[PDB]
Nucleic acid binder design. Structure first.
Ligand SMILES: [K+]
Ligand SMILES: [K+]
Ligand SMILES: [K+]
Ligand SMILES: [K+]
Ligand SMILES: [K+]
Ligand SMILES: [K+]
Ligand SMILES: [K+]
Ligand SMILES: [K+]
Ligand SMILES: [K+]
Ligand SMILES: [K+]
Ligand SMILES: [K+]
Ligand SMILES: [K+]
Ligand SMILES: [K+]
Ligand SMILES: [K+]
Ligand SMILES: [Mg+2]
Ligand SMILES: [Mg+2]
Length: 1328
RNA sequence: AGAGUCUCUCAGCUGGUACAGUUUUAGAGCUAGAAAUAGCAAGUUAAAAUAAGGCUAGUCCGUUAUCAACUUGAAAAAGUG
DNA sequence: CAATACCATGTACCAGCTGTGTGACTTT
DNA sequence: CATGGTATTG
C-alpha cells in the first residue's frame, strides 16, 4: 500500500492530504472513543489544522524591561530615604510614613491626611508659596536660608525620581552655552579664515533668531536675511545650517568634486568631518568645531527659555515661566469669553466631557486636542491674537509635566540637585558627607554591557561580581567586574569559527583579517599583455609590491590604479587586461589607514613584531564601547605612543566580527610546507590557491586538521534555533507533528514522496524613512504637503514622497492631486520577477516613458536619471538593490541568461527556511544507510513554489475562493502532492532541483514550458491523451480520468478542519486602571486596595474554562443545590487553581465538587449539538461558530469567474463570460445554500432576514458586483468568531453567542492534530 | 549543496535608560437658600502604584515558545485506534 | 434574557549579536 | 486590527 503526502505550511494553517497511486485520497473507518453510541466514523484523509499566530518575544521583553525600570526607580528613592532616615526622624517621625500611604483614603490612613507637614494650615501655606514643585526647586537652589528638611527631601526626590535621559556624555556648561557668544565666536573664527570676505554681524540678534520656536530651516532663513550679501547656501549659511541640526553640503563651498554632506547627529559625522578636513586642511577644524558648540547652545535653548544669569535653576525657572504665562493667559482668556460670548463659558471651563479647559485639566483632553477645540474660539473673538500666536507655536496654557520633557538631559536636573546640596550642606552636616552619595544616586545607571544584577536566578543575566555582596550605586566599580561582564556581553553572542569550533572569530576590522581578505582576492587576479601567451597569476613578489604600493597608500584600489600605478610604473606595460576583479577591489586595508592617521608611524605598522600589539588594540576597540574601559585596557601601551595619540586611539571604535579565527588565518600550518593559510595567500608558487582551495586540498594538512577540530537538540529546540519569524516556526513544528500522525495512520508505512509548499505599525517606519530622506535631501516637500503616517499606506502617495514629488523616468515634477492618472511600474518586469514591493516599483507619469517593456529601463532613461537616482540612494529613499536594477541597462541590461534564471526562480524554491523544513522531514524519514554508507532516500521531500499549483488551478478551472471556508488550505496540499509527484514522475532528472538531498534560450523555453504536459493543446500544438515517462514507460498522467479524480477530491464535503485548542496566556487583563465603581468586575491592583475605594482592572483573560459539577448554596437559607456550569479560570487565577483545584473551587462557592468530572476546556473546545450544529468555546461565557459551509464546486467556480477574482485568451474569456450568464440562476441557488445552512447551524434570525432583504434589494445590480458581495456574505457562515460584514452598502453587525449553557448538555469532541482520532463525551450524562 | 568578501535590505534575540498616561489621596472653594440648586471663584502641582505577586530574597523573577483525549507514572514520558 | 454599543497603554533614545535575500568577485 | 469583556437598554 503506497501513498504520498502533500503539505501547505502557513502562519495560521497547515493543510495536509494523503494521495495514492491514482492521485486519489483514501478514506478509512476510524475508532471513536467516549461514552456515545457511535463507535467509529468514516474520514477522508484530507484536512487542515488552524491555529492562532505565534508571537514574538518582543512585547514580553519590553514589559520585562519596564518592570526592572520601576523596581530600580523605587530603589533609588529607598536609597535617598535611607540617607535621610535618622535626621528626618528628629524633625518629623512620620513624614516618610505619610508619603508611603499617600494613595490610601483617610479611612485607611494610619496618620494625618496632609502629607508634607501633617496639618491643614501648614499644607495650605506650602501650596500657596510653591504652587508647583519647580517653585520649591528654584527657591532651594537660589536661597541662602536654612530650609525645612522635608522640603529638601521633596526637591531631591523629585529630581532623582524623574532624572532625565543619558543621551549626552560628559558634563554640561549652562553658562558656556550662550547662543549670542557662540554665534559671535563662530563669526570670529570665520573672519579669521576669510579676511578678504568678512561678515558684518552687528545689530543681528542671534539669541532671539536661533532660539526661536521655529523650524530649523526657517530660523536659518531668518538669520541669513539679517546678513546682506550672504546666502543660506554660502559657507557661513551652511555652518549655521549645521548648527541648527540640518544636513548641509559643503562640496560646493570648497570647490570639491565629491560631496561632503554633514549632519551633527549622524554617527558618521566624526569620520565625515575628518574626511572633509583631509581635503581642505586643518585650518578649518576651528571653524567646524566652533559651529558644533553653537549647536549645543541652541539645543539647550529649546529647554532653557530663561536667562541663565538670574538663577542657577534655569530649568525650574522655565517651568515657572510656563506656570506664570498659563496663569496670565487663563485670566485673560476667561475675561474674553466672559464678555465676548458668555454662553460658551460653561462648556469651556466646566464640562470635562468637552475638550475645553475643563476637559484639558480634569478630563481626558490632551494638549493637542485642547488646541484644536479652542483654535476657532480664539479666531472668532477679538483680542486673541497673542494667544493665537502662542497656540501655533504650541506654547499656550502649558502644563509643566508634558510629553516633550524627554528633551531634558539628566545633567540639568543634576545641576539643580548639586546646587541645593551645596546650599543646605551648610546647615545639615549629613548633607555635606552624603553630597556625593546623593549625587551618585541620580547619575548612576547600570552599564548596558553589565545587565541584570542577578545572583544565579536570571536566565537573562551574565554579570560576574568581583566580590559577593550587595551592589549599590556607590560600590559598583568595586563589586561588579565591569571588564569581564563587558566581555561576556559580546562573547555570549558572537559566533565561533565553524572550521575551528573552539576558536573565537576575529574582529571584522582586525588588521590581520583584512590582510587575509585582500590577499585572498588579490591571489585570484589574472593579467595578460602582448607578449604573453596566456593570462597569468600574480607572483608572491607582485602581490606584495601591489599591497605595499597601492593598498598601503590608498584606502580603495581601482583597476585603473592597478594598471597605471603598478603595471605601467613597475612592469612598463602600456596596456594590460585584468580579470578576477572589476572596477575596484572589494577588499581594503581600512584599519591600516585609520591607524596610520592616528599614530603616524608607518614603520611601526609594517613591523611584524608589532602584529600582536596591533591585534590586541583593535580587539579592545571592538570588544568595548566605553571610553574609560577602552582607555584602561590600552594602558599597557601608553609607553608606545604620545598622550595625543593615545587620546586619538581612545576615540576610535570599531563594531562587527569576522567569520574566521586567528588560528585559522595565520596559526595552523601545513605539515610539510610549514606555512599558514595567509602564507599561501601571499605566495603559493604558480597555483595561487585561495582560501576555499587550501582547506580542501588533500595534498595539504589543513583539511585533515579541520575535520579533527570539529566536535544534540530536540525537534522543538532545533526549530526554535532556525532563522525565521516565530510565526512560521509554529507552523513548521505543527507540520512535523502532522506528518508523524499521518504515518501512524498508515500503519507506520512511510510515504513515497512528501511535497511541501510554504506560503509567502509600518506607517511609523514609512514616515521616518521620508522625513530622514527629505531632510537629508534638503527638500521642502513636507512643508508644502503635510502628510500623516496612515496615508503612507497608499502606494502611489508613498512612492510620491520617496521620489520627492518627481517622475522617476522623466526629470519633471509630479502633481500630488493627479496621482490617480499616474502609473506604478515595475523596474524588472513582473513577467520575469514577480516582485510588487516598493523595492521593484516606481511612480512615473506614464509607463511608456520607461522604454521597451521586455527589459529593465532603457539606456536613455538611465543616462537621463542616474544622478537623481544617486541622490535618492544617499537619502535612503531607494535601496542599493533598487538603484542597481534601475541602472542595469548601462551594464548591458537584462541578458538572456538572466531571463532564464528569473523563470527558473518562479518554479524552484530557494528560501533557506524552506530548505530547513525539508532537511527536517528528510532526516526524520530516511534513517538507514546502504553498502556504501550513503543515505537511503526512501522518502523524497519535494518543495514547490505556490505559483505552480496556483497556475494549475487557473489553467484547469480548479479555482479557490478563500472567503467561502477553510477548505482551500486542505485542497492546496492535495494539489501540491498531485502536481509534485506527477512532475517528478514525468521528468526524473528534475530531482536535483526539487528533491532535498545531495543555451539560455533553451532553459528559458524549457522552464517556461515545463508544465505543458498536463495540457492537451498548447498555444497550435497538441499532445497525447496519456502522458508517460520516456525511459521507464510508466504512465504519469491520463488527461481524461485523472482530472476527474482531482475534481472528485475537491468536491468532497467532508474535510477535517481542526482549530488547535490553546490555553490562553499573556496579560492578566486590560491594562487600563479604571476609576472606582461598585461592580464585582473590578480587580484590585494591590492586595489591600479595595476596588470600590481605589478602582482597578477589569476584563481578565480566561486561560481556560473548567466544567464544574458540584452544589452551591442557595438563598439566605443556604440550601445545597446541584449544578453543572462553566467556570473561566483567569490567567491570574491559573497557578492558584492548579496547585489545589478543590480548595480553589470551594473558595469560589462550589461544594461537594465531583473531582473526577472536572474537564479542562481550552479556547476553541469543540461541541456538537443537534442537527450537526457545532460550537467552539470562545470563553467561559461566549461561543464561536463551529461549522464549515461545504459549498459545492460548481458554485465555487461560478463565484470565482463571476466575481472576476483574478487571464486567458479572448475565446476563453468570452466562453467563461457566457458560462456565467448561462448559469445566472446559481446566484439564487447560492443564497439558498447559505440560508439553508444558516437556519441549520448559524441561528441568527435577524441577520439572515436582513441579508435576504439586501440580496432581494440589489437584484438589478450587475452580476459581477452581486457576486463580489455574495463573497462578503460567507462571513455570516465562516467558522470562528462572529464578525460584521457589508452586503453592498448595508451593514450586518455580528450576532454573538453570549451564553455557553447549551454545551453543558451537548457532545464534547476531543480531536487529534489531524482530527482523524476522536473522543466524544456526551455531557448530558453528567450531573444526574 | 555550499564558503569568504563588497554594498546593502529585511528579520530575530538580549541589555541599559527616558517621557507621558492612568488611578487614589493632598492642594481649606465662596456666596445665597432648609434643601433642591443658582451665581461665582478655582484649575497648571505632588506622593504612591504601574501586571495580583513569588522565593531563590537578587538593585532577582513574573505576558515569548510548548499544550486533544486516554493508560500507566509523583512527575518526565512512553504507549493506545 | 435580546440587540446594541463602546472599549482596548502609548511614545522616545542608546548599546550590541545573529541570519536573511540581494547581486556582484572568487572558489569546493 | 479583532474579538472578548462590560454595561446599557429595553
Ligand atoms: K529594549
Ligand atoms: K485615620
Ligand atoms: K541675505
Ligand atoms: K487632561
Ligand atoms: K488633579
Ligand atoms: K483674532
Ligand atoms: K500629570
Ligand atoms: K568590485
Ligand atoms: K565597540
Ligand atoms: K608616552
Ligand atoms: K501561548
Ligand atoms: K501552557
Ligand atoms: K486538539
Ligand atoms: K547584515
Ligand atoms: Mg513591583
Ligand atoms: Mg506622572
Amino acid at each position: 500500500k503506497k501513498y504520498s503526502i502533500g503539505l501547505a505550511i502557513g502562519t495560521n494553517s497547515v493543510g495536509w492530504a494523503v494521495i495514492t497511486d491514482e492521485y486519489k485520497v483514501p478514506s478509512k473507518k476510524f475508532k471513536v472513543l467516549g461514552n456515545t453510541d457511535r463507535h467509529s466514523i468514516k474520514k477522508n484523509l484530507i484536512g487542515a489544522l488552524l491555529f492562532d499566530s505565534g508571537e514574538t518575544a518582543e512585547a514580553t521583553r519590553l514589559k520585562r524591561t519596564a518592570r526592572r525600570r520601576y523596581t530600580r526607580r523605587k530603589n533609588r528613592i529607598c536609597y535617598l530615604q535611607e540617607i535621610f532616615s535618622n535626621e528626618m526622624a528628629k524633625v518629623d517621625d512620620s513624614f516618610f510614613h505619610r508619603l508611603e500611604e499617600s494613595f490610601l483614603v483617610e479611612e485607611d490612613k494610619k496618620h494625618e491626611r496632609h502629607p508634607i507637614f501633617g496639618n491643614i494650615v501648614d499644607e495650605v501655606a506650602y501650596h500657596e508659596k510653591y504652587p508647583t514643585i519647580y517653585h520649591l526647586r528654584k527657591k532651594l537652589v537660589d536661597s541662602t536660608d536654612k530650609a525645612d528638611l522635608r522640603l529638601i527631601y521633596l526637591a531631591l526626590a523629585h529630581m532623582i525620581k524623574f532624572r532625565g535621559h543619558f543621551l549626552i556624555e560628559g558634563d554640561l556648561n549652562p553658562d558656556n552655552s550662550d547662543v549670542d557668544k557662540l554665534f559671535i565666536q563662530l563669526v570670529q573664527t570665520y573672519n579669521q579664515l576669510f579676511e578678504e570676505n568678512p561678515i558684518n554681524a552687528s545689530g543681528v540678534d542671534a539669541k532671539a533668531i536661533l532660539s526661536a520656536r521655529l523650524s530649523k530651516s526657517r530660523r536659518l532663513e531668518n538669520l541669513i536675511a539679517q546678513l546682506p550679501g550672504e546666502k543660506k547656501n554660502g559657507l557661513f549659511g551652511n555652518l549655521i545650517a549645521l548648527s541648527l541640526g540640518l544636513t548641509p553640503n559643503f562640496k560646493s563651498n570648497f570647490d570639491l568634486a565629491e560631496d561632503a554632506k554633514l549632519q551633527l547627529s549622524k554617527d558618521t559625522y566624526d569620520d565625515d568631518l575628518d574626511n572633509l578636513l583631509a581635503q581642505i586642511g586643518d585650518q578649518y577644524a576651528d571653524l567646524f568645531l566652533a559651529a558644533k558648540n553653537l549647536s549645543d547652545a541652541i539645543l539647550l535653548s529649546d529647554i532653557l527659555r530663561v536667562n541663565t544669569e538670574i538663577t542657577k535653576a534655569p530649568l525650574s525657572a522655565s517651568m515657572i515661566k510656563r506656570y506664570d504665562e498659563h496663569h496670565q493667559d487663563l485670566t485673560l482668556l476667561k475675561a474674553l469669553v466672559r464678555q465676548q460670548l458668555p454662553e460658551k463659558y460653561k462648556e469651556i471651563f466646566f464640562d470635562q466631557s468637552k475638550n475645553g479647559y475643563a476637559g484639558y485639566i480634569d478630563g481626558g483632553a490632551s494638549q493637542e486636542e485642547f488646541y484644536k477645540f479652542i483654535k476657532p474660539i480664539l479666531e472668532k473673538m477679538d483680542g486673541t491674537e497673542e494667544l493665537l500666536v502662542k497656540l501655533n507655536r504650541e506654547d499656550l496654557l502649558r502644563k509643566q509635566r508634558t510629553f516633550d520633557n524627554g528633551s531634558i538631559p539628566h545633567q540639568i536636573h543634576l545641576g539643580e540637585l548639586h546646587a541645593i546640596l551645596r546650599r543646605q550642606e551648610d546647615f545639615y552636616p549629613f548633607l555635606k558627607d552624603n553630597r556625593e552619595k546623593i549625587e551618585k544616586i541620580l547619575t548612576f545607571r547600570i552599564p548596558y554591557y553589565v545587565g541584570p544584577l542577578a545572583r544565579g536566578n536570571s536566565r537573562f543575566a551574565w554579570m560576574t561580581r568581583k566580590s559577593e555582596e550587595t551592589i549599590t550605586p556607590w560600590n559598583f566599580e568595586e563589586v561588579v567586574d565591569k571588564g569581564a561582564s563587558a566581555q561576556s556581553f559580546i562573547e555570549r553572542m558572537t559566533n565561533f569559527d565553524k572550521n575551528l569550533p573552539n576558536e573565537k572569530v576575529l574582529p571584522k576590522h582586525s588588521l590581520l583579517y583584512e590582510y587575509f581578505t585582500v590577499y585572498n582576492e588579490l591571489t585570484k587576479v589574472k593579467y595578460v599583455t602582448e607578449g604573453m601567451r596566456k593570462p597569468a597569476f600574480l607572483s608572491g613578489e607582485q602581490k606584495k609590491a601591489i599591497v605595499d604600493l597601492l593598498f598601503k597608500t590608498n584606502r580603495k584600489v581601482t583597476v585603473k590604479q592597478l594598471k597605471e600605478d603598478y603595471f605601467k610604473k613597475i612592469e612598463c606595460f602600456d596596456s594590460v587586461e585584468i580579470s578576477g576583479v572589476e572596477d575596484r577591489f572589494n577588499a581594503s586595508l581600512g584599519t591600516y589607514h585609520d591607524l596610520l592617521k592616528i599614530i603616524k608611524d608607518k614603520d611601526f605598522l609594517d613591523n611584524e613584531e608589532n602584529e600582536d600589539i596591533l591585534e590586541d588594540i583593535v580587539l579592545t576597540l571592538t570588544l568595548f564601547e566605553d571610553r574609560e574601559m577602552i582607555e584602561e585596557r590600552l594602558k599597557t601601551y601608553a609607553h608606545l605612543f604620545d598622550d595625543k595619540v593615545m587620546k586619538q586611539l581612545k576615540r576610535r571604535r570599531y563594531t562587527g566580527w569576522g567569520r574566521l579565527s586567528r588560528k585559522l588565518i595565520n596559526g595552523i600550518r601545513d605539515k610539510q610546507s610549514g606555512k599558514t593559510i595567509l602564507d599561501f595567500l601571499k605566495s603559493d608558487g604558480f597555483a595561487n590557491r585561495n582560501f576555499m582551495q587550501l582547506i580542501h586540498d588533500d595534498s595539504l594538512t589543513f583539511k585533515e586538521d579541520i575535520q579533527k577540530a570539529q566536535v544534540g537538540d530536540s525537534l522543538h529546540e532545533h526549530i526554535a534555533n532556525l532563522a525565521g519569524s516565530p510565526a512560521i516556526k509554529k507552523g513548521i513544528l505543527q507540520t512535523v507533528k502532522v506528518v508523524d500522525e499521518l504515518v501512524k495512520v498508515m500503519g507506520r508505512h512511510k510515504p513515497e514522496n512528501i511535497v511541501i509548499e510554504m506560503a509567502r505599525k509600518n506607517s511609523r517606519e514609512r514616515m521616518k524613512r521620508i522625513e530622514e530622506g527629505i531632510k537629508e535631501l534638503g527638500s521642502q516637500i513636507l512643508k508644502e504637503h503635510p502628510v500623516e503616517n496612515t496615508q503612507l499606506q497608499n502606494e502611489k502617495l508613498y512612492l510620491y514622497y520617496l521620489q520627492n514629488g518627481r517622475d522617476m523616468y522623466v526629470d519633471q515634477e509630479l502633481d500630488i492631486n493627479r496621482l490617480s492618472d499616474y502609473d506604478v511600474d515595475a523596474i524588472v518586469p513582473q513577467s520575469f520577477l514577480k516582485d510588487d514591493s516598493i523595492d521593484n516599483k516606481v511612480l512615473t507619469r506614464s509607463d511608456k516613458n520607461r522604454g521597451k517593456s521586455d527589459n529593465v529601463p532603457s539606456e536613455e532613461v538611465v543616462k537621463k536619471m542616474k544622478n537623481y537616482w544617486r541622490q535618492l540612494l544617499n537619502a535612503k529613499l531607494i535601496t542599493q538593490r533598487k538603484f542597481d536594477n534601475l541602472t542595469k541597462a548601462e551594464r548591458g541590461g537584462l541578458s538572456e541568461l538572466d531571463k532564464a534564471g528569473f523563470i527558473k526562480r518562479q518554479l524552484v524554491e530557494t528560501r533557506q527556511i524552506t530548505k530547513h523544513v525539508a532537511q527536517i522531514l528528510d532526516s526524520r524519514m530516511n534513517t538507514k544507510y546502504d553498502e556504501n554508507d550513503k543515505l537511503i532516500r526512501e522518502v523524497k521531500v519535494i518543495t514547490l513554489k505556490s505559483k505552480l499549483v496556483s497556475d494549475f488551478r487557473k489553467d484547469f478551472q480548479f479555482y479557490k475562493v478563500r472567503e467561502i471556508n477553510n477548505y482551500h488550505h486542505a485542497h492546496d496540499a492535495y494539489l501540491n502532492a498531485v502536481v509534485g509527484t506527477a512532475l517528478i514522475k514525468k521528468y526524473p532528472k528534475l530531482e536535483s532541483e526539487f528533491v532535498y538531498g545531495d543555451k539560455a534560450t533553451a532553459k528559458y523555453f524549457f522552464y517556461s514550458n515545463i508544465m505543458n504536459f498536463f495540457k492537451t493543446e498548447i498555444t497550435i500544438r497538441k499532445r497525447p491523451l496519456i502522458e508517460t515517462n520516456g525511459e521507464t514507460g510508466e504512465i504519469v498522467w491520463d488527461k481524461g480520468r485523472d482530472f476527474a479524480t482531482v475534481r472528485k477530491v475537491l468536491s468532497m464535503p467532508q474535510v477535517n478542519i481542526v482549530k488547535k485548542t490553546e490555553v490562553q496566556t499573556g496579560g492578566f487583563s486590560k491594562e487600563s486602571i479604571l476609576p472606582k465603581r461598585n461592580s464585582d468586575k473590578l480587580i484590585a491592583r494591590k492586595k489591600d486596595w479595595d476596588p470600590k475605594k481605589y478602582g482597578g482592572f477589569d476584563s481578565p483573560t480566561v486561560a481556560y474554562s473548567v466544567l464544574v459539577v458540584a452544589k452551591v448554596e442557595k438563598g439566605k437559607s443556604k440550601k445545597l443545590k446541584s449544578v453543572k456550569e462553566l467556570l473561566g479560570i483567569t490567567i491570574m487565577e491559573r497557578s492558584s487553581f492548579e496547585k489545589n483545584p478543590i480548595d480553589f473551587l470551594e473558595a469560589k462557592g462550589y461544594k461537594e465538587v465531583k473531582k473526577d468530572l472536572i474537564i479542562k476546556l481550552p479556547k476553541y473546545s469543540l461541541f456538537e449539538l443537534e442537527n450537526g450544529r457545532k460550537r467552539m468555546l470562545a470563553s467561559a461565557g461566549e461561543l464561536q461558530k463551529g461549522n464549515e459551509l461545504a459549498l459545492p464546486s460548481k458554485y465555487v467556480n461560478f463565484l470565482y469567474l463571476a466575481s472576476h477574482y483574478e487571464k486567458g485568451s479572448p475565446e476563453d474569456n468570452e466562453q467563461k463570460q457566457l458560462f456565467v450568464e448561462q448559469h445566472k440562476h446559481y446566484l439564487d441557488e447560492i443564497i439558498e445554500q447559505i440560508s439553508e445552512f444558516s437556519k441549520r447551524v448559524i441561528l441568527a434570525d435577524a441577520n439572515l432576514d436582513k441579508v435576504l432583504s439586501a440580496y432581494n434589494k440589489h437584484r438589478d445590480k450587475p452580476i459581477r458586483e452581486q457576486a463580489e458581495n455574495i463573497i462578503h456574505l460567507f462571513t455570516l457562515t465562516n467558522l470562528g468568531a462572529p464578525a460584521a460584514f457589508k452586503y453592498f452598502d448595508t451593514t450586518i453587525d455580528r450576532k454573538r453567542y453570549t451564553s455557553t449553557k447549551e454545551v453543558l448538555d451537548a457532545t464534547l469532541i476531543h480531536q487529534s492534530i489531524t482530527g482523524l482520532y476522536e473522543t466524544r463525551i456526551d455531557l448530558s450524562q453528567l450531573g444526574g
